[PDB]
Design a protein around this ligand. Structure first.
Ligand code: NA
Ligand code: NA
Ligand code: NA
Ligand code: NA
Ligand SMILES: [Zn+2]
Ligand SMILES: [Zn+2]
Ligand SMILES: [Zn+2]
Ligand SMILES: [Zn+2]
Ligand SMILES: [Zn+2]
Ligand SMILES: [Zn+2]
Ligand SMILES: [Zn+2]
Ligand SMILES: [Zn+2]
Lengths: 489, 489, 489, 489
């Protein structure tokens, strides 16, 4: 299925077409049934009066069928709470995700009535519902999707970016939804390398025993009992003289069995999704680099499978991390933070990055801190904290803050015999999601001298049985000021 | 220990002899203490009056010693409920299984007073108590067992069949009781091939990577993490021009650790017994083919070990089955149904079987449906359902019906990304044992156009620490009309 | 909200009307867009061609909107499995239950195109979706519902019965949905007495200490720690000279905390629904007696609350039942079977009933035997077993059989010091749901000399957060031959 | 034991004296061993050189003995993270709480070298270590404690306030530490009434059946199964013409067994502490009103015991709250939010409060959001959120923000039959601690038109086996601008 975003209502192809109209109630109230909109809608809506009559009756928000199978109106609420995004983009996903198109549909046509500040989140929300991945052996249909944005200020360059963002969103979700017997560490390295090639990146791949020899103890020791070997992949977009040097470090655990401290019968399904951080960072990097990204930018992907054999990590094991510090592993399922400790140290030490983001499906505890729609951000930099929350609101990839207090909470990871433990299996003073992030930061002085932000996306990376494609929209809005894209600037 | 069934009371060898007399109360009441019976019993019972006095006193059923160590009378109840077998054959097993014979016993002599409809189940029940398998390093004794049936209608050919049935029962139980460090997949293939040779079968063995290449995704992917490789074994008894074409498909999981969704500390012991279906089908095939079986008959054994390594099945994995359909594995311990989906498809597609039975120690849930004495049968064919229940009653291998409703229950296995999941780990609309069977049937249109019967024997395949040898008696009575055996015809 | 069933399409009141059309695909294919149907549907469907075009496109089954908010077509599948009802009535409930009507809807008009054998189950399925009970403090709307049945053979008397059946269904569900702080034992006694008065019944109420004095040890000892006292209520419809004498005994546990063997935090919610058996028997009795029921009929309601105090049942307690037999209570949460043992003994001994039905939300184990749509029936009478399965199919209140084997399974309830225990907390030979029923039957010789049927409806009595109103439709079809209703005769 | 705070080092009584010196490293480095300090310290520290030598050697923070039993120096760190308080007051508690004084100690003398912004938190931290409550039958000693603050800017009025704050802190902790067989609902009403009398408050007590009659369904129904009756206590400090009208609503669950959804064997100990919110609000009110509080102020205490009997709340029960809204109780252990829903509605409706704080030991989930040192604040007012975080830093009673999103999260409490449920026992979209607060706010439109702040203090209210006395310091700093106290103004 192909998704194209266009600036203004235009005709779609020949072939059976499903029509979905999307807007906030206040915007829809002001839409005139005339012109190109009338041309598109009058198959399903009789005339202007019937249009106006319907808009009068329908509530503050919801989904209303305009035909027995081919057409829908989605009303987005106007009101929002301060913890929400004022775009209410999640409401589009909620109403749209259930919709199925008749078997012989060729085209899906969206007419999106969105004000300029809403366009990006609304487009992304629609894109997320076009799930690339299926292994069904019948019934597979490819559709031609046009998202036609009705918004004065939108440029043609904006529409290119939104098409690329839609792709980055759907790619992130595809990578997440693919089972790990197919998306192995090798396959995810190959996926990253494809983006590396497309973006003209400098590509570094350190794999298997090369990781051990190079001192990547976290990445190596976590992944050594996988069926295919661990890897660290760097895509670098180097801009001579750039003022910023930004790293996007992603957790790429292609499957997490928990390791020898194994997950339960009901805990282990869904664990193909434990690489959602790496997928989201990779696809964010792709969207940004496609649009004239003016600063130096690196994607650093820590790609392992956490599995069970006599050579696997065992609780009590002490390993030496890339940083040179020792970690006592008391929880083999707290493996993401080990691999990210190496990725973030590499970004600081080797890449000389001065802004380091890491994003990970890190903890089940994250949902108890920020719920299922907000990623949980922990940073040494207060201004960056405010800025990423603002970016979450503008993108629809919501972000809530975690407490940053290494002085109060790092003692939760005290070890008698190593520099630290990787987890605490009892009562601790910190929120567990914060403590998990502090294990990562402990290998770069908790961000001292630079800006470091850890983002835990375990719950917002998925809804139901599907990846959401979280990450590309967030980082496009956060770092989009360094692109050529008018709506990001 | 050797077991011979004879038509009428006869002398036994020289050597210390244990005597066990068995009968329903009403039959025993009519036995005259004279003739050959008196000859055998008067070591232990004084005369006719003392015999009659005892029969008067003893209750409606039980076991009564006739000597301090050498002799017993077992009284079988006459009454039975409609859900039971009117043979009450389980009562013989209950009373007999505890009996031990003195160390220096050479012979065990049974005098079985049974009416013609009871003989087969009663003989089988006695046979089950002679457990072949032991690895004790002292105390091992081999006995000469004669089961002398006192029944007017019995023929000498019947006695040959009953001896063969006794062997098939004891062989099934031996295979079940043998620990899996000895009965590996390789060893069970060898056992099936021995029966293949003895029966003059056409033998097909597809093993290891040959399964993968041939498209047996269920059998291969389940067994790939075993210490010895997966196999599919077919023994074919082809009868040109036969009207029926019958397949006996058996679950041969030589050990089930549960896989990466591992069984618990108390759940995993006994899991050598997870090949009881394959053993019972193999030994049923053997008993039938020994007696002039007039229709085309196949034994199809799916032989795997379900174990734990980095290459094992993981929940989320999607595989392609022999049928070409995809299955999302969300439960690595729901492995029997995966391997049987291939076996049943093979029987339909390759063997052209038009009656397909599969029998398996499939689910713990089975005991909550049919209890511990009845196998649970699910079939698309109502007449076959009645016929197998009738066969259960006549054989003593009891069978109770499951609901057959793919329309109501198959939705329990819905998958977003594959054709189906293999299990449901939450609330479901179907009985879990039925849903387990429907996963198998989903790969042959739930039996459309043919007769398909799935039989879950998890609990009735064992009592205490011992296999019961369930299966040969059931299928001998069910399919015995196609043999030369008078009592089956 | 009022529900009226009419014989043929007729006009509805003034006021905003929602229209729902219901039929099997094959029936809908043959409907002509003319006459009264056209009059009703042409608000929403343009003309005959558009009607025919739509019917061509829509799949084998589902729900299709005919308007943005006011109208729906529900297509019922034609095909069904042998374990299902050929009415497919559950499909109506599945598609209809989600539908919401706009706030200002006055009328809901159903046009039901059903063949004669489908009408009763289809009407009941629609009725179940009109939930009487709500304590919402805004948004409450009462609707005028007309179910217009288009069926040649239907009589006006049939339509009266179907209206009464709809009421009995909705009343059963109302009683179930009402929280137990409102529907106390006292309140449920009052509800039964209201039906007693309306039906001109002879009414007996034995309450509190009168139960103890009268020897109702099961009912008394279970309910003695409730906040309001235990009761046994009998409504009798005595027909001099009748050939049959039928008792409907219902489990009326208004709330089940489990007792001192208390339910878990997640196990205890929903336990207001533990009186669903009593509600269903009461409302079945009501529907039958309204229609000239020609045999002697009794409703016997065992009404208790199972709660926690120093005077409550404790495991180890031994009580004397109405039967005079002693029961060792080893499970205070196996309380339904204790109260029903008294109700069934009373029906036999005092009422002289020769057909005794008991219906109960008895066991969580029931779903593992018969799933969530089928009640599980255990009876001493094979013909009655077949007849109730047939009644389940005709009514849509599905029934599946349990094994009846007191000889094999009653030993699961062996006690060293009382006549029996009420449960087995370990491994047992019977299906647990069957063993639960056998505790009841043990107090009437397992039905010896009469017909006894126990029906466990724990799961089919509810879907989601709502009672289904199971029971009235089943018993109307089972016992409707004794009424004046043409469609039941 | 009596605690007096003084402005400057002064002599203490006759009698054996323990000396504890407290300061940040940077402050201690600048202290001259002369004058009054030398007079006090030279018992334990030889002279200036030995003083300076020691200060040079000791690390950045810790505790160092100055005598074998009588004396200690506590060094407080200078550095702090942004999530911490820059006072580092918790470090004082950590080092001091372990200290024991010899049996015959009469006096404890603190010399506190603190800069003006640190004084309040440091004093409070010392006060918390003087635990009032003990029922030991030997070894009980009362001490005379003088905390001598060495700080230029401190006034004599400040020292009065700090003495009162010390008392409020120790009183809160005493109430918390007292077992509930002593601190019953009656006893806690009496405690509140004592403060009511001392402060010249208008006192309202609504108790037992008066709560039911007055419509306090939350307070009444939660507490009705306690051994002593539920109560609602209001202390009002009414200031004619005041611009603000502030309510402090506290959760006073004197013991929480969990109710019929009972707590576990290891979950139930410590549940005397479930009234920590009410204690902290009461003692905050006391400290503020003692110091010329210029605005209208109310303490509203919801005082219940949540226990187990046949009349207790049961999950499924639906009650009507003071607000008139209905709540379906699906979790009897989610009882604090029910009682607070009434308290907050009362504060809005009856008291006309326009700033409403509620504070509660509400959820175990709170520690997963904000950890064990920070209360978790959820408010409709962003400025108030910032202001209370600032107050947490200045007081040492730390506060972290929760997400405020009723639009996103209130759907977690959806009910089919009541206006809402009180909890969600499965997966929810919100942080569970936020959802718990939203149940409270749902009864006042989530704060619409006013300022509402909910503060969950479950973990920060205690360390080890002792109440911390959290709350008085926080509200003194938050609302101290309305007092006459120079250091608060
Ligand atoms: Na298809
Ligand atoms: Na020996
Ligand atoms: Na309303
Ligand atoms: Na002492
Ligand atoms: Zn993990
Ligand atoms: Zn992980
Ligand atoms: Zn298994
Ligand atoms: Zn298995
Ligand atoms: Zn119960
Ligand atoms: Zn019950
Ligand atoms: Zn509680
Ligand atoms: Zn509480």
């Amino acid at each position: 299925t192909q998704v194209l975003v266009r600036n203004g209502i235009q005709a779609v192809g020949d072939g059976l077409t499903s029509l979905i109209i999307v807007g906030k109630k206040s915007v829809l109230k002001n839409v005139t049934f005339e012109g190109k909109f009338k041309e598109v809608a009058q198959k399903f809506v009789t005339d202007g009066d019937s249009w106006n009559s319907m808009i009068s009756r329908i509530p503050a928000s919801g989904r209303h069928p305009l035909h027995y199978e081919l057409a829908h109106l989605i009303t987005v609420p106007d009101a929002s709470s301060r913890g929400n995004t004022p775009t209410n983009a999640h409401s589009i996903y909620k109403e749209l995700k259930p919709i199925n198109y008749p078997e012989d549909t060729k085209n899906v046509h969206f007419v999106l009535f969105a004000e300029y500040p809403d366009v990006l989140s609304h487009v992304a929300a629609i894109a997320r519902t076009f799930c690339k991945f299926s292994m069904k052996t019948s019934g597979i249909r490819e559709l031609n999707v046009n998202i036609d944005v009705v918004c004065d200020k939108l440029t043609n360059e904006d529409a290119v970016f939104l098409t690329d963002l839609s792709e980055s969103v759907r790619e992130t979700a595809r990578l997440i939804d693919t089972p790990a017997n197919i998306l192995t560490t090798d396959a995810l390295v190959d996926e990253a390398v494809k983006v590396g090639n497309a973006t003209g990146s400098k590509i570094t791949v350190i794999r298997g025993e090369e990781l051990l020899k190079a001192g990547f103890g976290g990445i190596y020791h976590v992944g050594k009992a996988g069926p295919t070997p661990p890897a660290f992949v760097v895509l670098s977009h180097e801009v001579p003289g750039s003022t910023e040097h930004i790293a996007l470090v992603g957790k790429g655990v292609v499957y997490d069995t928990g390791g020898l401290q194994i997950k339960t019968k009901t805990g282990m399904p869904n664990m193909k999704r434990d690489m959602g951080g790496a997928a989201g960072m990779l696809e964010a990097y792709s969207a940004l680099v496609k649009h004239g990204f003016s600063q130096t930018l690196h994607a650093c992907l820590c790609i392992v499978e956490n599995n069970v054999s006599p050579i696997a990590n065992k609780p009590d094991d002490i390993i030496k991390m890339l940083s040179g510090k020792t970690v006592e592993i008391n929880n083999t399922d707290a493996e993401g933070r080990l691999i990210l400790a190496d990725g973030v140290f590499y970004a600081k030490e080797t890449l000389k990055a001065t802004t380091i983001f890491d994003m990970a499906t890190l903890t089940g505890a994250q949902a108890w801190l920020s719920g299922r729609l907000h990623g949980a951000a922990m940073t040494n930099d207060e201004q960056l904290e405010n800025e990423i929350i603002k970016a979450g609101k503008a993108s629809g990839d919501l972000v809530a803050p975690m407490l940053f207090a290494p002085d109060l909470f790092f003692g939760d990871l005290k070890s008698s015999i190593a520099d630290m433990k990787n987890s605490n299996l009892g009562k601790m003073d910190g929120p567990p999601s914060a403590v998990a992030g502090l294990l990562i930061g402990a290998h770069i002085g908790f961000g001292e001298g630079l800006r470091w932000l850890h983002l835990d996306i375990a719950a917002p990376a998925e809804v139901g049985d599907r990846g959401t494609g979280y990450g590309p929209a967030l980082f496009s809005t956060l770092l989009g000021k360094y692109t050529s894209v008018p709506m990001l600037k």
